[PDB]
Curated annotation (Swiss-Prot):
The chain holds residues 724 to 1036 of 1055 of the full protein. It comes from Homo sapiens (Human). Residues 1-312 form the PDEase domain. A divalent metal cation 1 binds at H72, H106, D107, D217. Disulfide bonds: none annotated. It is found in: Cytoplasm, Cytosol. This is cAMP and cAMP-inhibited cGMP 3',5'-cyclic phosphodiesterase 10A. GO terms for cellular component: cytosol; glutamatergic synapse.
Length: 313
C-alpha cells in the first residue's frame, strides 16, 4: 500500500516528456507501465497483485513480430500517459483508468498483417468481424484476459462503472483502426472551427479519445530522429512480409508493401506525414493545446525525411 515504483533519475525525468523512448531493457517495461498508472491514476486505482498478473498475461499475448509487439504496446501507453499528465483536469477517474489499459491492450495478439490481408486470405477472423477485423479481435482478447482468475483489475468498480470503463476501452481500441481516423478527424476539424465542439457531449468526448488513440498509436513519428528512423525499419519489415504473402495469393501488393520498391520509402514517408500524421497532431493541438510538443516533433521528423530525399543524409 505504501509501495511506490520509482525509476532511475534519467528515466524519472525523461518519462514525463512526449519523446521518451522506453529503451531496450524489456524487463523494465512492466515497472515503467506501473509507474505511469500510479502517477496518472493513483496507487489505489488497481490491486498491485492483479495489475502485475494482468500486465504479464497481456505481454504473453503479444507476438514476436517486428513492430506490432509488446514494446509498441508500452510505447503507445507512455504517449497516452504524457497526454493525460499535461491535461490533468480534463479527464474523469474512469477515463484515466481505462485509457492506459486500452493502450497497453490495443494490438493484443497482432500477427503483423493488415485487415486487408486477413480479408484476402479469408482468415476466420474476417468472417467473425467484417470491419475493423483486428481491432475487434484486440478488444475480444482484452476481455478474455480480464476474465482470467486473479486478473480482474476493475473488480472494485460498481456494475455500471465497470460497463462504462469496458465501453471506453472498446471505443478506444476500435478507434486505432486507421480507416476510421480520416472521417473522425474531419468531423473534429468542423466541430472545433464552427465552435460546436462540446466536451460534456459524450459523442464528442468519444471522438476526442479516438483522436488521442490515433495520436498515441502513431507516436513513432514524434520521437527524436534516430528513434523514428530505426522504428521505420520495423514498420516496413511487417509491410514487406505482408507484400510477400499477397504475392503468394497471386496479388501485386501496393508499392508500400513491395520490398522491390524500397527506394520510394522516403517519398512514402512524406505522403504519410502530410496525409496522416501532421493533420492528426494539428487537430489534437487545437483541441488540447498542451499536446503541441507532438506536432512540433512530427514537423521536425518530416523535415528530416525531406533532408533524406535531398541526399543530405
Ligand atoms: C507510425 C507509422 N505508421 C505508419 C503507417 C504506414 C507508413 C507507411 C507510409 C507509406 N509508405 C509508402 C511507400 C513506401 C515505399 C514505396 C511506396 C510507398 C506509402 N505510404 C502511405 C508509415 C511510415 N508509418 C509510420 C511511420
Ligand atoms: Mg492496431
Ligand atoms: Zn498499434
Amino acid at each position: 500500500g505504501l509501495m511506490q515504483f520509482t525509476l532511475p533519475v534519467r528515466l524519472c525525468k525523461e518519462i514525463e516528456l512526449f519523446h521518451f523512448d522506453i529503451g531496450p531493457f524489456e524487463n523494465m517495461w512492466p515497472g515503467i507501465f506501473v509507474y505511469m498508472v500510479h502517477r496518472s491514476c493513483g496507487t489505489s486505482c488497481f490491486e498491485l497483485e492483479k495489475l502485475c498478473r494482468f500486465i504479464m498475461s497481456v505481454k504473453k499475448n503479444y507476438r514476436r513480430v517486428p513492430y506490432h509487439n509488446w514494446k509498441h504496446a508500452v510505447t503507445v501507453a507512455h504517449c497516452m500517459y504524457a497526454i493525460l499528465q499535461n491535461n490533468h483536469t480534463l479527464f474523469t477517474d474512469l477515463e484515466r483508468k481505462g485509457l492506459l489499459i486500452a493502450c497497453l491492450c490495443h494490438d493484443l495478439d497482432h500477427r503483423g498483417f493488415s485487415n486487408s490481408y486477413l480479408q484476402k486470405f479469408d482468415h476466420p477472423l474476417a468472417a467473425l468481424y467484417s470491419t475493423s477485423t483486428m481491432e475487434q479481435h484486440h478488444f475480444s482478447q482484452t476481455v478474455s484476459i480480464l476474465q482470467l482468475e486473479g486478473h480482474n483489475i476493475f473488480s472494485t468498480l460498481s456494475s455500471s462503472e465497470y460497463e462504462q470503463v469496458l465501453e471506453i476501452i472498446r471505443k478506444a481500441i476500435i478507434a486505432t483502426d486507421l480507416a476510421l481516423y480520416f472521417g473522425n478527424r474531419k468531423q473534429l476539424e468542423e466541430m472545433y472551427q464552427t465552435g460546436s465542439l462540446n466536451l460534456n457531449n459524450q459523442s464528442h468526448r468519444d471522438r476526442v479519445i479516438g483522436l488521442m488513440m490515433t495520436a498515441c498509436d502513431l507516436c513513432s513519428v514524434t520521437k527524436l530522429w534516430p528513434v523514428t528512423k530505426l522504428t521505420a525499419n520495423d514498420i516496413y519489415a511487417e509491410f514487406w512480409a505482408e507484400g510477400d504473402e499477397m504475392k503468394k495469393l497471386g496479388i501485386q501488393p501496393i508499392p508500400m508493401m513491395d520490398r522491390d520498391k524500397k527506394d520510394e520509402v522516403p517519398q512514402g514517408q512524406l505522403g504519410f506525414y502530410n496525409a496522416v500524421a501532421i493533420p492528426c497532431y494539428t487537430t489534437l493541438t487545437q483541441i488540447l493545446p498542451p499536446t503541441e510538443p507532438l506536432l512540433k516533433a512530427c514537423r521536425d521528423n518530416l523535415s528530416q525525411w525531406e533532408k533524406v530525399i535531398r541526399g543530405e543524409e
